[PDB]
Design a protein around this ligand. Structure first.
Ligand SMILES: CC(C)(C)OC(=O)N[C@@H](Cc1ccccc1)CN(O)C=O
Ligand SMILES: [Zn+2]
Ligand SMILES: [Zn+2]
Ligand SMILES: [Zn+2]
Ligand SMILES: [Zn+2]
Ligand SMILES: [Zn+2]
Ligand SMILES: [Zn+2]
Ligand SMILES: [Zn+2]
Ligand SMILES: [Zn+2]
Length: 181
């Protein structure tokens, strides 16, 4: 497996609804949880492991044998709190890059579980922060999209280094450039 890095177009592509709730889905969910634990995460979205589907694995405790393993298939955020909070946010798709992002403090979510059954969940604090970050991934939205112009300016060169790395690895032009903003 791999974590897909910016500016790989997989991180922007449309993520497809999941219709099939079978053993293959269970196997993918297992693999994703295990990447999440390997990388000390609280949540992981399918596009970040190269699969453009509406799937997130999540454990609010973010540690083995703690919290709960929540599978969110086709999730939708139904409500965002009016209250906003800043947080020094990171992203595995942008290795070593951290910057301030302002987001709602809490959210309410509708999703389907591993069997396709509807459920809802409310999150606050760090779990809500991580969820929103990963939910953005499911909508092809990356964390610098959420930064102020001033904060973005502070990481532009780091993003350009990633753009160059992609061009060197693939022989293709970077499909997006932070310059465009
Ligand atoms: C920032 C605007 C476009 C006003 O609304 C959103 O993108 N809302 C976000 C929640 C949010 C994130 C960060 C700061 C403030 C609110 C929800 N959203 O993507 C709606 O399309
Ligand atoms: Zn691998
Ligand atoms: Zn496993
Ligand atoms: Zn596991
Ligand atoms: Zn940890
Ligand atoms: Zn992630
Ligand atoms: Zn991320
Ligand atoms: Zn939006
Ligand atoms: Zn430039």
């Amino acid at each position: 497996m791999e974590i897909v890095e910016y500016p790989d177009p997989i991180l922007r592509a449309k993520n497809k609804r999941i219709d099939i709730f079978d053993e293959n889905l269970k196997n993918l969910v297992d693999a994703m949880f295990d990447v999440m634990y390997k990388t000390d995460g609280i949540g992981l979205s399918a596009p970040q492991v190269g699969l453009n589907v509406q799937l997130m694995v999540f454990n609010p405790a973010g540690e083995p044998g703690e919290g709960k393993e929540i599978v969110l298939v086709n999730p939708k955020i139904k409500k965002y709190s009016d209250k906003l909070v800043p947080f020094d946010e990171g992203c595995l798709s942008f290795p070593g890059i951290y910057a301030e992002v302002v987001r709602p403090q809490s959210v309410k979510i509708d999703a389907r579980d591993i069997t396709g059954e509807r459920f809802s969940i409310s999150l606050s604090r760090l779990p809500a922060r991580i969820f929103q970050h990963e939910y953005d991934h499911l909508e092809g939205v990356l964390f610098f999209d959420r930064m102020t112009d001033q904060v973005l300016d502070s990481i532009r060169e780091e993003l350009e280094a990633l753009e160059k790395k992609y061009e060197e690895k693939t022989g293709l032009p970077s499909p997006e450039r932070v310059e465009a903003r």
